[PDB]
Design a protein around this ligand. Sequence first.
Ligand SMILES: [K+]
Ligand SMILES: [K+]
Ligand SMILES: [Mg+2]
Ligand SMILES: [Mg+2]
Ligand SMILES: [Mg+2]
Ligand SMILES: [Mg+2]
Ligand SMILES: [Mg+2]
Ligand SMILES: [Mg+2]
Lengths: 87, 200, 135, 163, 81, 131
Amino acid sequence: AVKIRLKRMGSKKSPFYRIVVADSRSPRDGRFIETVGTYNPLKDPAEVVLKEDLVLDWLSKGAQPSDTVRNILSKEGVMKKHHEAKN
Amino acid sequence: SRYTGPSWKVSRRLGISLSGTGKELARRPYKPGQHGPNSRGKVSEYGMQLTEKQKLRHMYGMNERQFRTLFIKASKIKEGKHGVNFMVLLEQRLDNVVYRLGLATTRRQARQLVNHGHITVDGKRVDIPSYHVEVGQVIGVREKSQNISTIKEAVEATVGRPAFVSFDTEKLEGSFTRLPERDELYPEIDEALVVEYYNQ
Amino acid sequence: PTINQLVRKPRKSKVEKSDSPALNKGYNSFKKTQTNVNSPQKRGVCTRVGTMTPKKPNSALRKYARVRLSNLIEVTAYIPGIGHNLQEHSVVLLRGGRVKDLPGVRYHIVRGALDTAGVNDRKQSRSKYGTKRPK
Amino acid sequence: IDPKHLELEDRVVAINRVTKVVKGGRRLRFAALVVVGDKNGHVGFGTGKAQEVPEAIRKAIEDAKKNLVEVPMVGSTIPHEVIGVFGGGRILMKPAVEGSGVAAGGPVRAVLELAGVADITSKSLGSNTPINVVRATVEGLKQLKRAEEVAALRGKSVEEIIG
Amino acid sequence: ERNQRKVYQGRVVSDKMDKTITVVVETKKNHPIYGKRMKYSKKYKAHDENNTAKVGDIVKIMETRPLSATKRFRLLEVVEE
Amino acid sequence: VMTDPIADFLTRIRNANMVKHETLEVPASKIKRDIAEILKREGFIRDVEYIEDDKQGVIRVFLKYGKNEERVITNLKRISKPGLRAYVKADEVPKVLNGLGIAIISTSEGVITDKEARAKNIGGEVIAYVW
RNA sequence: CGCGGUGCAUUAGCUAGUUGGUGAGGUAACGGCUCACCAAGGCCACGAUGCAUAGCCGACCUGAGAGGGUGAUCGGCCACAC
RNA sequence: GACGGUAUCUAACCAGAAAGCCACGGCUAACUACGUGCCAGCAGCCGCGGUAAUACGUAGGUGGCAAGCGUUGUCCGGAUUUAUUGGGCGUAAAGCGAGCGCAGGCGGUUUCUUAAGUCUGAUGUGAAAGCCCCCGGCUCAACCGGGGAGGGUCAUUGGAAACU
RNA sequence: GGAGGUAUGACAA
Ligand SMILES: [K+]
Ligand SMILES: [K+]
Ligand SMILES: [Mg+2]
Ligand SMILES: [Mg+2]
Ligand SMILES: [Mg+2]
Ligand SMILES: [Mg+2]
Ligand SMILES: [Mg+2]
Ligand SMILES: [Mg+2]
């Protein structure tokens, strides 16, 4: 399935993540179509960067995020906008 | 690696007072060894180049690869003169900052203070004598370590400091106030010879 | 040359080659072929140990060993230093390098590796010739 | 063309111990090549011979003073690229950027440091004979030109030429 | 409006075949190292609907699906006998 | 034969310049006329004149010397030999001697200098440098 | 499908479902992909065929650049699973 | 929360437990003594050694690097030593013994035409990572991350046509 | 004045 998930980067014991649009068939780090932001919890809070337009376009086109990405997009208000646009 | 060996031996090979004292040249201004005082023969341009390079890394207690990388990072600059920028980047090392501020008598003493952690930058401990320093920062002795008698002796035995620095004794904090300058550095060195050396 | 000539036949470089072809080859017992492998060192079995007379400006007894390699190429090497524990059938390790005295010796023997004993009472240039420190 | 009223300082390229042969063996002499200049444009070279190093040096200096030439400069650089040939010694010299320093390892480095060219890119293509490489060097520096001279020849203005 | 599939102009060299021909293009690439403007006589097979084209005649051909194993191109014109 | 009359023209100029002759005559063509006019109006030549004769228009040149002795031209060189022809882009336009010489180029606009080409942002065939 | 990237001519000829066509079958689909039938065409000195070698690429090392050499780690395409 | 009671921070203590490798005739920075006596041995090249060895071996001393150093093997460069950039053929290597000519390579002046080559505008793509520039976080650095730049004898369309 | 033709010798140093 087409999905919106996050891939691992940075050194060991100091992680970092890029939100990415990946099929479930591809690897954790491998094929992707588009990057729409990035993430790390290494701050005292979590810290986030996002590309609302493209991520909402993929969600419309049929994407299916993971749980933690759903949490992030909730905090950033994208899931709510997608819901509204479907209403 | 760090050099635990004699100071005067190096200084009197090179034919220069590194400490600016003189007694690393006084009474014996000739290269070490039992072929020291006798008639040295001619010497080559490669020898002169190597000697100039060794002057600097023996001042700053540095390693060849650190020296080379710092040379390359100076080469990456276009806004000035090459070897002068090299010397400035040497000056921006806590080993030399501690010395120029009069907070220690020797660069070895200074490196030991830095690494043992008696010094701060903007209020944060640093055990890294190679730590680069930008113009505007604030070096500061550790407020617990201000009680050691060695540093107080070294600070109250201070001759007039350089022009490119600011410093207070009660606060034991100082900083650079300039790039700093070239001519205010040791003019005994010919940086062009280092340039030709590492142009190879 | 004209450019037409340089297109009809291009510049074909001066072919190069090694000072140690024996090290640049291998052997698999299954297919039994020279496998081309760039190996710095090799193992061998001394098939003879002897002395040779060097070229004219020099005069000496240069100690050599003819050796049977892992790759079944038989090779003449030099026994550097002063003294050796070597005999026929003595396992030995070989490195590259000419011996400018005799022509037919493109190789050297390594000390402190295998059955080759370390040199005895060599204190300077000691890694070379392979003998542990005097404490 | 006059060494008078100039602070010419010298530098020795090489001393080639050179022999003549006689019934009584070998007559060994020293031949020296010296390059002298003022680091303003004016530079020359000289060949000396003698049974003594300093005597041949003196003779070569005194012959170099009598054979000077002036090189143009542009911010411690030459104006344009040039190829100098003199019988087996090809040297190409390019105008380099400022701060890049000299690119040579003697004798060309000596010639150009004495002439006052602080920043240049050079290369010895052919032989390595110091005499002929130095001669090809001065031949190239003679091939070189001045914008004012070329513009006064052509009639066009300086800006009208460089564009 | 939709895309446009590739087209070439060339010359005929053989018409001994039914419903088909061979066509030659004659570009000129520059030799990659030495830079000389070389010839390059690429050629193709074209589907003729009616065996119209004649040998040594200029022609245009557009690509299409494989009509045979060799064929990939479709006749369009006949220009200079 | 004359497989390269442009280079023959350039070399005839060079030869006369080396012997320090004063004038030249050449079986001309329009590209030679263009080059001669460029040299006329760029300062490497004093004067140039035409002659119309039935086989082919002759063109005669009157060379230039700063004195009786000094030369204005030093040497020329064709690059499109033509065995290897030199076409170049507006960025790859050469700069003969950092602007103390001139490269002669033919472009869509016509036969022009590196000045005009590198200004207009065009390129074309290079046919001659002039030191 | 265009174009491109390795050595040998002490390898000059190669192919016969091979080349094309009329039908039929067949595949997710085009077409000799396959069968019959008709014709003898088709490829090549711009290097076919054969022999050897090799996974290709982004990239890596070097170099003034042109270029050379490599294709380990990471990613992409391919191929394989005694 | 496997890592993990690890990172990290605090305090007590000991200079105390923590430096070697290669080279030193020239190319190449670095010199003497003793033994040995074309033997032992050294050697990247030139070459040292035959009773006074700065070249062997040891000792002292010095120099270059430094938790590494040296050596082999491989690649590049220097090597313009396969020269497109960027070489040559009288004597050094090399002009076939000489000619007739298929193919190809090249080709006089010039009008008109085209536009294959060439030049050129715009659009797209050239994934990410990496090189490079500006930023920022790891006690700095390596490293890590963000942003940008560039990269195609690349492709479509649209013009010129001086030159081939 | 100049051009074309008309028996052995050790090795190294
Ligand atoms: K493979
Ligand atoms: K020794
Ligand atoms: Mg190079
Ligand atoms: Mg020396
Ligand atoms: Mg030794
Ligand atoms: Mg002795
Ligand atoms: Mg010959
Ligand atoms: Mg990329």
